């Protein structure tokens, strides 16, 4: 039954581990399909966007410190939307893309666009916006895989930039938050049972406040799994709140100005109603659009047919290796379709190619977003979708 499957999976993984050394990466190593969930990393990112109400609360909050707390709430709430067993998303192919949208209770929509911008090393970029609430998010995921011995990790070097476009700072620019990502570990691979943990530091920074949240690992006897600990501070040394609890259970916030008060409930992740993204019908999706590209693999995963899932996945990744070979032969390199390389000194490697003026009518912003890629039912690809972003910005100003 399943104890026999578990033993054979255990052996398969030991046979991979046997040929490694702590500190080296897993980019060359193919992991088995039975540790895959049925979504691409491009879609997995949208798990973290499933609580837009906290972001809407942040946007309407006048007090800067309280607004920061709501941003922290929005960002922490997404992490527990995650697979239950030891599973990871499919690694996207170079140029794979995924679009999705949300129908928000306030009759507005949220839009999401993403693309895998690099394979060596892996990187994807994503863009998310709620134009009628003046909310814009840009980010990149940069996972650097590492075998560590009894554990392995995705060292998460990406980051996220959140802007409230109609909340201006002293320079008359939108209020900006930069949010980093903790690392994702699997521990117990050598002498235990595998379990996924978050670890190390998550940094959230705004113009006037900052929070360094440590994702702790359990002690031998003391502590719990999934514990977090951090302090909300200004840039002048003043500590205002302490966050504690567990990122997949209840998180607590203690007011540090009142030493007698007790930590109060900040986030109870089992009492939250996530808002899942919507996606265009499969019949309208492109060849390298995530759900369509991986449909044969995920169908086999859903019926636990791992020989077929392994073969279908191999054919996709082998085709990508051949395409990469052809690029070398042609003397060219890949360039993303939807994201332009950022200018030096900025927080992100890549930004969506389309210019979206910060203060223009949100109906014009929505129209510009919908021109980037098919998001809503009925939208069609154009010829221009498939040319590089750097050629689309040349024409975005050549006619001007």
């Amino acid at each position: 039954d399943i104890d026999e499957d578990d033993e054979s999976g255990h052996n398969i993984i030991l046979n991979i581990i046997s040929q490694l050394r702590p500190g080296c990466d897993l980019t060359r190593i193919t992991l088995p399909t039975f540790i895959l969930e049925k979504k691409s990393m491009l879609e997995r990112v949208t798990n973290q966007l499933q609580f837009p109400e906290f972001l809407l609360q942040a946007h309407s909050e006048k007090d800067p410190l309280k607004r920061f707390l709501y941003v922290m709430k929005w960002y922490l709430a997404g992490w527990h939307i995650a697979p239950k067993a030891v599973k990871k998303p499919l690694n996207p192919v170079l140029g794979e893309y995924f679009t999705a949208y949300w129908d928000l209770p306030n009759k507005q929509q949220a839009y999401y666009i993403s693309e895998q911008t690099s394979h060596h090393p892996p990187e994807c970029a994503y863009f998310y916006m709620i134009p009628e609430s003046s909310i814009r998010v840009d980010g990149v995921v940069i996972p650097k895989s590492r075998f560590l011995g009894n554990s392995s990790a995705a060292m998460m070097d990406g980051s996220t930039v959140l802007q409230f476009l109609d909340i201006k700072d002293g320079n008359g620019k939108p209020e900006k938050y930069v949010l980093t990502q903790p690392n994702v570990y699997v521990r117990g691979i050598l002498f235990g049972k595998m379990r996924i943990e978050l670890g190390d530091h998550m940094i959230i920074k705004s113009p006037n406040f900052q929070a360094d949240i440590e994702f702790k690992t359990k002690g031998y006897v003391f502590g719990t799994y999934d514990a977090i600990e951090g302090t909300v501070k200004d840039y002048d040394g003043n500590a205002y709140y302490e966050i504690s609890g567990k990122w997949n259970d209840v998180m607590y916030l203690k007011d540090l100005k009142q030493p007698r008060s007790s930590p109060k409930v900040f986030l109870d992740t089992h009492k939250e109603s996530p808002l899942r993204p919507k996606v265009r019908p499969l019949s309208e999706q492109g060849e390298y659009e995530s759900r369509k590209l991986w449909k044969k693999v995920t169908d086999a995963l859903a019926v636990r047919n791992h020989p077929v899932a392994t073969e279908e996945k191999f054919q996709i990744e082998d085709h990508q290796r051949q395409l990469a070979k052809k690029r070398i032969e042609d003397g060219v390199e890949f360039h993303p379709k939807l994201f332009r390389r950022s200018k030096p000194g900025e927080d992100l490697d890549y930004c969506i190619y389309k210019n979206i003026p910060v203060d223009e009518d949100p109906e014009k912003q929505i129209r510009s977003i919908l021109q980037i890629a098919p998001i809503l039912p009925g939208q069609q690809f154009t010829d221009k979708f498939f040319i590089p972003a750097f050629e689309k910005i040349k024409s975005q100003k050549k006619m001007i």
Binding site: Q108, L338, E363, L370, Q379, Q380, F381, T382
Partner: peptide, 19 residues
């Protein structure tokens, strides 16, 4: 430059009563 065709009416909250 547009990579996608638009819906006939750009959706907003100000025309959701129609939709």
């Amino acid at each position: 430059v547009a990579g996608a065709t638009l819906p006939e009416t750009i959706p907003t909250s100000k025309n959701y009563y129609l939709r």
